[PDB]
Amino acid sequence: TAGLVLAXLLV
């Protein structure tokens, strides 16, 4: 995660 954004599977 980037704040409340998923940068793919899974950050």
Collapsing DSSP to helix, strand or coil, 5 comes out as strand
Helix (H, G, I), strand (E, B) or coil at 2: strand
Under DSSP, the state recorded for 8 is S
| Helices and strands in the chain: count of H runs, count of E runs | 0, 0
Please report, as a single letter, which amino acid is at residue 7.
A
User: Burial letters for 1-11: b for 16+ Cβ neighbours within 10 Å, e otherwise?
Assistant: eeeeeeeeeee
Method of determination?
NMR
Omega within 30 of 0 (cis) for the link into 10: yes
The two structure tokens encoding residue 8: 């793919």
Distance CA 2, CA 10 (A): 11
The rounded distance, in Å, linking the Cα atoms of 4 and 1 is 6
CA–CA distance, 8 with 2 (Å, rounded to integer): 10
Q: What is the DSSP string of 1-11?
A: -BTTB--SS--
